[PDB]
Design a protein around this ligand. Structure first.
Ligand SMILES: *[C@H]1[C@@H](O)[C@@H](O)[C@H](O)[C@@H](CO[C@H]2O[C@H](CO[C@H]3O[C@H](CO)[C@@H](O)[C@H](O)[C@@H]3O)[C@@H](O)[C@H](O)[C@@H]2O)[C@@H]1O
Length: 330
């Protein structure tokens, strides 16, 4: 598959087998940032699930354990001192998925311990009747980039454990977030600050985690209202966070946002699979599928001679270049 060629190329260009970490760029001077490494972890897991090449599948399965090992070697196992609740939760969510694939108890303990630290200590009802703080060092804002990923992490932990506590957490987080961090119609706000209120800046990765938490809640509950929520957020994305030809936007120069199409595509694939399997929203499903295929082909067609795609789809960086690889590993 094109997904096989894209992932092997991405590994050949950016994977460091000594440190067991991705390089940040094609100069190979520094390794990827901590949180982005959890998102390239998930990319390896998504290529693992996508490929029907059994030799590549087995090599990616090994790489799932190596990405964790390289990160724990550099940083330790206990990430609860990191001041960013979102740094912790990206890795808790990756760890839950690694448990689903491998069954290695260390990944369940990592996921649970890190999720529980954030939800139990950083969910607050003093400010705005709920929601998780951005930071554990200072409590001034509650952000989409911690709240929707936390919901997703809780839904993985519910799927793994069937402990209803995790479904209750996912539901409480998502309900609060739809009320306080969206316009009620699919546009996901960046954050809500104590002093200055809502900041209605939308981005690919916050549309993405909203969509993924909504689809996950649909799968856990069978309540169609959650798939409606996902559809409205996908429709916002396809009509607003795109150029005039319908290609998803380039969000640089911000280093966190430049690769956010990676997180968006991952979640849009969950919505695509669920609409295809359920027959929900069939008119939207057919149009969504056409729009995704157009985007994936615009990514495919943007490769250099080493089969790496820079994130401006309309020196190569691993986060920016990851989005095309994710798009081809739906
Ligand atoms: C947590 C963790 O990954 C840490 O390493 C990151 O530094 C941290 C970044 O999050 C902040 O910045 C992003 C991007 O902010 C910019 O884009 C926004 C959307 O357009 C805009 O509102 C903001 O003013 C900036 O221009 C935000 O998306 C986050 O909410 C947060 O402010 C990770 O959160």
């Amino acid at each position: 598959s094109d997904g096989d060629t894209a992932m092997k190329a991405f590994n050949d260009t950016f994977w460091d087998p000594n440190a067991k970490m991705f390089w940040k760029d094609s100069k190979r001077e520094k390794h990827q940032d901590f949180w982005v490494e959890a998102e390239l972890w998930e990319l390896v897991m998504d290529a693992y699930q996508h490929t029907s090449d059994p030799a590549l599948k087995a090599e990616l399965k090994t790489q799932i354990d190596d990405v964790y090992d390289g990160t724990v070697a550099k940083y330790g196992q206990d990430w609860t001192n990191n001041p960013f609740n979102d740094n912790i939760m990206w890795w808790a969510m990756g760890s839950a998925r690694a448990y689903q694939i491998t069954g290695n108890p260390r990944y369940l303990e990592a996921a649970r311990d890190h999720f529980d630290f954030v939800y139990d200590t950083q969910w607050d009802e003093e400010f705005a009747n709920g929601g998780i703080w951005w930071l554990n060092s200072d409590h001034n804002t509650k952000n989409a980039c911690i709240n929707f990923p936390a919901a997703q992490a809780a839904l993985y932990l519910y799927d793994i454990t069937k402990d209803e506590h995790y479904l209750n957490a996912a539901t409480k987080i998502f309900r609060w977030g739809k009320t306080m961090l969206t316009d009620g119609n699919g546009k996901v706000f960046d954050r809500i600050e104590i002093e200055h209120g809502a900041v209605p800046d939308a981005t690919h990765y916050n549309q993405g985690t909203y969509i993924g938490s909504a689809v996950g809640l649909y799968k856990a509950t069978g309540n169609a209202v959650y798939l409606d929520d996902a559809v409205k957020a996908a429709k916002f994305t396809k009509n607003h966070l795109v150029d005039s030809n319908g290609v998803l936007n380039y969000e640089g120069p911000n280093g966190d946002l430049k690769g956010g199409k990676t997180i968006l595509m991952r979640n849009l694939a969950h919505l695509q699979k669920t609409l295809d399997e359920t027959g929900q929203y069939p008119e939207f499903s057919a149009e969504f599928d056409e729009w995704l295929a157009f985007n994936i082909e615009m990514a495919w067609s943007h490769q250099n001679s080493d089969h790496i795609v820079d994130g401006n789809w309309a020196t190569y960086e691993s986060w920016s270049s990851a989005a095309a690889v994710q798009a081809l590993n739906g």
